Structures are given as C-alpha cells and as structure tokens.
Design a protein around this ligand. Sequence first.
Ligand SMILES: CC(=O)SCCNC(=O)CCNC(=O)[C@H](O)C(C)(C)COP(=O)(O)OP(=O)(O)OC[C@H]1O[C@@H](n2cnc3c(N)ncnc32)[C@H](O)[C@@H]1OP(=O)(O)O
Ligand SMILES: CC(=O)SCCNC(=O)CCNC(=O)[C@H](O)C(C)(C)COP(=O)(O)OP(=O)(O)OC[C@H]1O[C@@H](n2cnc3c(N)ncnc32)[C@H](O)[C@@H]1OP(=O)(O)O
Lengths: 316, 312
Amino acid sequence: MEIKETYDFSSIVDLWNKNIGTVYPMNLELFKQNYINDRQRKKIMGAFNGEILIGFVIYKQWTYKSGSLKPNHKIGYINSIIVDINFRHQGIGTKLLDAAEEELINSGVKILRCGSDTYHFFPGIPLECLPSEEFFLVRGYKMQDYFYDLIGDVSKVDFKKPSIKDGFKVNVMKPEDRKGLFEFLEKSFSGRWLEEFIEFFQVGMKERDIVLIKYKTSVIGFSHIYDNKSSFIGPPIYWKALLGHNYGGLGPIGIDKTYRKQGLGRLLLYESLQILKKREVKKMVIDWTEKDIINFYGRFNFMPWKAYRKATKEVK
Amino acid sequence: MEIKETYDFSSIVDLWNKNIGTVYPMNLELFKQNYINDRQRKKIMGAFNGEILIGFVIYKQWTYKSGSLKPNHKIGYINSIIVDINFRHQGIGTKLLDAAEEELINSGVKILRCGSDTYHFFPGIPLECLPSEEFFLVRGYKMQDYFYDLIGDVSKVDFKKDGFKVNVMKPEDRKGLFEFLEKSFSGRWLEEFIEFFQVGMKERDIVLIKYKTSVIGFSHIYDNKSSFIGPPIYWKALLGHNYGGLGPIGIDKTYRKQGLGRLLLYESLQILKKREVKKMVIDWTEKDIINFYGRFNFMPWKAYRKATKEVK
Ligand SMILES: CC(=O)SCCNC(=O)CCNC(=O)[C@H](O)C(C)(C)COP(=O)(O)OP(=O)(O)OC[C@H]1O[C@@H](n2cnc3c(N)ncnc32)[C@H](O)[C@@H]1OP(=O)(O)O
Ligand SMILES: CC(=O)SCCNC(=O)CCNC(=O)[C@H](O)C(C)(C)COP(=O)(O)OP(=O)(O)OC[C@H]1O[C@@H](n2cnc3c(N)ncnc32)[C@H](O)[C@@H]1OP(=O)(O)O
C-alpha cells in the first residue's frame, strides 16, 4: 500500500459515493467547483493499493485573504477524509491524517479544524459520521458544539406578512444594486461573506440568486437564495439529489449590525421565502445554523435535517 | 379552542404531514395500522377551532402484557404531539400535554416517556424536533441518551463455521422460534412476534440462525412486499424504490462475541440484496452498537433523544 498525492477527481467522487453517497451524494460537478475554485494552499493525499485508490484526505491551510482580513496561517482544515469500507481498521486513515497533519504543522499550523473550510463540504463532523468522532478523539481533536442544516417545504405553508416599518423594502438584486452591495459588505461583513461575494460572482453567481433589503436608498441586508436554475452550487444545495424536483435553499443571510433585533431579518427571510415559493420551490435547505437561531427559521416550518459537530485539535 | 378526544385519523395524518412530513412522511395505512393494533390503554386528544383540528397528542399507559412480562402501570408514553405551525405559542401544546399527563397520572402513572411505546412512531424525541426539547424540559422531562436509525445501501458493496446455519424461516420453525424467544427474548420482542404474526407478518420476513437444529438467533427483515409495516420501513417514502430494513436482530446470550451476530447479519443482508433491496434502515440502535452495523456500511441517519419525566 502506498500514500501519494492525487488529482483523480473521478475516482475520489466514486469512493465518496460508494462509502457515504446515501447521505452525502456527491457529483463531479460539485466536487470540482469546490476543490478547483478554492484559493487556499490545498492538497489531496490518496492511499493506493497498486493503481487502485482505497482512501483520501483533503486538507487546506488558511493562506488566502478573507475580504479585508488577512489569513491566519495557524489554522488548518481537514476538508474530508474517507477510507474505503473494505480497507478500514488497517491503519490507513491514521497514515493519511498523519501525513496531512505533519505537512500542515510544518507550514506553521497550530489549530486543526474538521471541516468549516472555504468551499467546505461539511461544517463539522457529520452525525452520519459519528463513529469517526472517536477516531478524531484518539488523535487529540476536541468535540465541541453542533451545527445544523435545516429543511423545509416552502410549498406547503402560507404565512402572514410580518408588519413592516415604513422606509424598508425588499427586492431581488438588480445589476445596478451591485456597488451598493459591496459598500454595505465592506462596512458590515468584510471577512468571509465579503470574500464569498467576490469569488462567487466570478464563477457563475447571478444577481437573481440574491435578495436585498433596503432602508430607502440604502442596502442594509442580504440573502443568498438557490433554486434549480442557480448555476453556482452553494452549501444549501450541495445535497440537492436528496431534495427532489424543484429544490431550493437559502443562506447566508445578514442584516447590518445597527439594524438588528427590530424584525428586519424576519422580513428579509419572509420575502426571500416568498420569492422562492413564487418560483415553485418545494423542499429547501438552510445550511450551517446554530442551535440558538433555529427557531428564527422554525417560525417558517424549517426543522433540523443534518447535524455536524465542530472539532478542533490544538498542536502541542 | 376546544380540547377533546378525536379519532379522525385522516385529519391527524394531514396535520402531521403539513408540519413534519418532510422528514417523517406519514401515510394513513401506517397510522391506522399502529393505532388500531396497539393493546395498551390509549387515547388521542385533539385541539379544535370549531370543527378544525389544529393540534393533537397521542398517549398510552402500559396496561397490556409484554411477552412474559406483566404490564407496569407506572409507565406512560407520549406517542406523539404536534400543534399546527400557524397555531404555535398560544398554549395549545401545553393544554394537550397537560390533559394527557393529568389522565395518565390519575391512572397511576409515575414515569412518562417520550416515544418508546409499543407501535411507537419514535424511539424518543427526534433530532428534527430538537426545538421541542425546550418545551419538554420546562415541563419536567429529562433528556437522556440518543438512539439512532441507521441507513445503508446493500446494492452498493460486496463483503466476504461448524454446525451453524442461517436461513429464512420455514413454517415448521414456528415452535422453535417461540421456545427460543421465551428463553432469550421473552419481553417485548416475544410480544412483538406473537402480535405481528396475528396482523400480517410472514415467515419470509424472519431469518433464523441455528446450531444444528437449535434456533440460537433471529432477525426480522423488510422489503416492499412485507405487509407488516414495522419501524425500519416506517419512513419508506424517503428510501426510494426497492426500500427495505432490518430490526430486530438478536443472538442467545450464551453464544455472543464469537461472530455469530456478524454471520446472521451478513446472511440477512445477503437475502435482502438478493431480493433487489437498495436503501434500507436499521431502527433504534444504541451508540455502542453502531459499529457492528457500520462494518456493513450502515451510517446513522436519524437520531432520537430519550426523555423521561418522573411524577413528583
Ligand atoms: C472532517 C471529516 O472528514 S468528517 C468525516 C470523517 N469520515 C468518515 O466518517 C468517513 C467514513 N469513515 C471512514 O472513512 C473511516 O472509518 C475513517 C477515515 C474515519 C477511519 O479510517 P481507518 O483507515 O479505519 O482508520 P485507522 O484504521 O487508521 O484507525 C481506526 C482504528 O483501527 C484500528 N487500527 C489502527 N491501525 C491498525 C493496524 N495497523 N492494524 C489493525 N488495526 C488498526 C485501531 O483500533 C484504530 O482505532 P481508533 O478509532 O482508536 O483510531
Ligand atoms: C414525543 C414527541 O412527540 S416528540 C415531537 C414533539 N413534536 C414536535 O416537535 C412537533 C413540532 N412542534 C410542535 O408541534 C409544538 O412546537 C409543540 C407541540 C412542541 C409545542 O406546542 P405549542 O402549542 O407551541 O406549545 P405552547 O404554545 O403550549 O407552549 C410553547 C411556549 O409558548 C408559551 N405561550 C403560551 N401562551 C402564549 C401566548 N399567548 N403567547 C406567546 N407564548 C405563549 C408557552 O408558555 C411556552 O413557553 P415555555 O415552553 O417557556 O413554557
């Protein structure tokens, strides 16, 4: 058996699906979008029996800026790791993770995160991969808090518009809203969400996938929405193969800090779902939420669908 | 808003599906099967706006024997409780649960369980219902351990002893199965075999492992021809075509930790595989046992939290 770098995205896709595809159905198109466009120092290490891939690990170090923010080189990520079901418990996963970890630590990494990377597949250890928690524990990852993807069927329920302060309006993005948007982001959301706007518009995001809330002239919030027309596949629709015909999703969503806790997110959410409903969306996902914000979406009949556990290893 | 007893199953099922059908798709056949066949003292209390059902609770007291076990009347169950999404946070859940708990307690119940009943829909509070834990916590329920339904696709992967034989049950096995059950699994699983056979379970849904001519273990398996709809295939609308399941599975205590469970499992999966099963579920497992199924590529799919209230 041999460990060496690999770029055979196809064979990686097949191994993924063969082992976990029932709950995380991967496609080559999503896989390549996310691996290829990621801008961090990244690598895929493969484990091989002769010519045959029997395992892999995808790992990154934070080396590229996040909006106005510089990279913190102390952070590394395990994007994913999977050993083939017929080759488990032979030391292969350990070998593969030792190699990834060794390389990251030599490049200055002190904190290793399970998922949560840019172009992540997972916000943390999926609950479907709960048995791997013990594997990560042995290696010195600490199991921390949970995150949830939520699911709902926006076709099935009708809601009363929450009552609305005057001056505010909410509309899908027009191309001339764009300078307005980036100013607002530079001001209120200048790390990861600013960066994602930047990169995502370069690889097929359209204004129609964006909803904006205004106080008179001014942009004070956004949501990113998804349907079967979106060409950029974002987290909410990663697992669209499970979601049926007329799938959708929503996230992120953000209101300028000075405008929060006055019902405006509720209004943005309502209208963002209204748009999706009018587009005939049925089942849709809201990705990567915290336990404390679930009921904000629950008011609209969303429920937790997947769970992920944050996990972090501190290098000695 | 009126609280009173209902048996309008169709209304209940519709409300069910409107609120949680995305993750727990209910059909009227399953609903009726489980409600009508349960032998406990049971009731459904509905919440109504005029003639319109806007919430319900189903609840049960353990009043009927479980195999060799006598009923313990101290145990009650909240089978399910749902208030419609447009009527939440007005006290309806509270009134329904209060009515259920008041009746159970007046009948001698001292311990209230969320799910875990005979003909349960849930082994405990689903993770999809995680926001309800607050509602129950405030009302005195303690949140305990998790259990999991596992999922796997037997169509996707291939895998690889003296006097041990595994085969689909034959009708002549009836007696041996019963004797075995009475010896090794003489509570709830014994009760299930008795009751399931009287309501449509066939010999083809049972796999037996024998040492010589002695039954020493069994599994119950499910496909799209089973007429008994048991927990592994409750949520078959989510599993695609050629769905199946497995559970329970058991080996005589005497014979465990020697690979015989593994073999019974292997052969049971083989049989399902040969029946053209794809996506299938293993219901209600403990964390400590997930890896036993995991060797065959099964993964946690749904989680449920055990929750218990002690009446004070
Ligand atoms: C950020 C994320 O990617 S989260 C997703 C994590 N991935 C998954 O859940 C995918 C499905 N699971 C898997 O692919 C695998 O089980 C993995 C990747 C988690 C583990 O890979 P494996 O190759 O089985 O791991 P490995 O064999 O190194 O170690 C596992 C165990 O096997 C045994 N083992 C280790 N080395 C050997 C050896 N040389 N000989 C025999 N047994 C061994 C040990 O008991 C070890 O115990 P541990 O759990 O305490 O470490
Ligand atoms: C075993 C099982 O069934 S597990 C599955 C449980 N079911 C579900 O998860 C389905 C989805 N959820 C639901 O159906 C509901 O949310 C339930 C059944 C959990 C609760 O139903 P509700 O009718 O919202 O409950 P109710 O309104 O009585 O109480 C909710 C809160 O609103 C409060 N409330 C009561 N009246 C009012 C009012 N007029 N205005 C605002 N709040 C109110 C209650 O005090 C309560 O707060 P508390 O928990 O801090 O005491």
